[PDB]
Design a protein around this ligand. Structure first.
Ligand SMILES: C=C(C)[C@H]1CN[C@H](C(=O)O)[C@H]1CC(=O)O
Length: 258
């Protein structure tokens, strides 16, 4: 059967082509993960249909409801066959679905407006005049919650209680708030999105310091899937031959504006 790929709109992973209105099917999307899906399909020998995740979410389990949302939920409930998106490999997700080896390696990072006296996470926690927060939900937020490393455990302590919520709802909202915040707000996000935005006009932001942790993005399939082993060997083949790094330069640095 034809494989149903769940993915999500987020630059430069997946975006609607300009002429999307006059296009159909897989031809109406473009991006790192669209390019990646085509490669994975060619290597594993399958025809597929790219679909944008119903709820625009990635994957989390509602507390008492115990229902999984997002792309992971589409995999878990059988609404999708494979998830090709910037979906962070985490324990809670790997408990319910399968992840391939990373196709991309990243880590949480700090994004500041050009000119901020913050050069590190320590610099951040040790003060308070400079605001700093994460996405309202996602893997970065859970990193600070499930945390007990001196600075990170202390950083979380500070965030939850912050006055204006310091938490944002989207990536574009954290960037918009760092730029409209005129120096006061620092956004904590994944290095990948950070590297991408550091290459967009007005070229007024920048990644600072090293990453807080070492993670990866993986292609997910429902636990015990026939496709699992194939996609996993596909990712390793793509990495080894260097195509993964070419695809990143393409979507991140070839068209760099700064
Ligand atoms: C863009 C979003 C909401 C995603 C992308 N990977 C992370 C994930 O899969 O949880 C989330 C970002 C973050 O939490 O910093």
């Amino acid at each position: 059967k034809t494989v149903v790929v769940t993915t999500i709109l987020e630059s430069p992973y997946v975006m609607m082509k300009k002429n999307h209105e006059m296009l159909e099917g897989n031809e109406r999307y473009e991006g790192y993960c669209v390019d990646l899906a085509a490669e994975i399909a060619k290597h594993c020998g399958f025809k597929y249909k790219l679909t944008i995740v119903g709820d625009g979410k990635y994957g989390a389990r509602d507390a008492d409801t115990k229902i999984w949302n997002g792309m992971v939920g589409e995999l878990v409930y059988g609404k999708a066959d494979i998830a090709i998106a910037p979906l962070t490999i985490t324990l809670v997700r790997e408990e319910v679905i399968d992840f391939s080896k990373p196709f991309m390696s990243l880590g949480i990072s700090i994004m500041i407006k050009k000119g901020t006296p913050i050069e590190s996470a320590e610099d951040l926690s040790k003060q308070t005049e400079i605001a700093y927060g994460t996405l309202d939900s996602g893997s970065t937020k859970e990193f600070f919650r499930r945390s007990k490393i001196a600075v990170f455990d202390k950083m979380w302590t500070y965030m939850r209680s912050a006055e204006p919520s310091v938490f944002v709802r989207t990536t574009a909202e954290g960037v918009a708030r760092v730029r409209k915040s005129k120096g006061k707000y620092a956004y904590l996000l994944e290095s990948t999105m950070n590297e991408y935005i550091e290459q967009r006009k007005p070229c007024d932001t920048m990644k600072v310091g090293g990453n807080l942790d070492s993670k990866g993005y993986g292609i997910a399939t429902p636990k015990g899937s026939s496709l699992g082993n194939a996609v996993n060997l596909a990712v390793l083949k793509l990495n080894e031959q260097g195509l993964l790094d070419k695809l990143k330069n393409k979507w991140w640095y070839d068209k760099g504006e700064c």
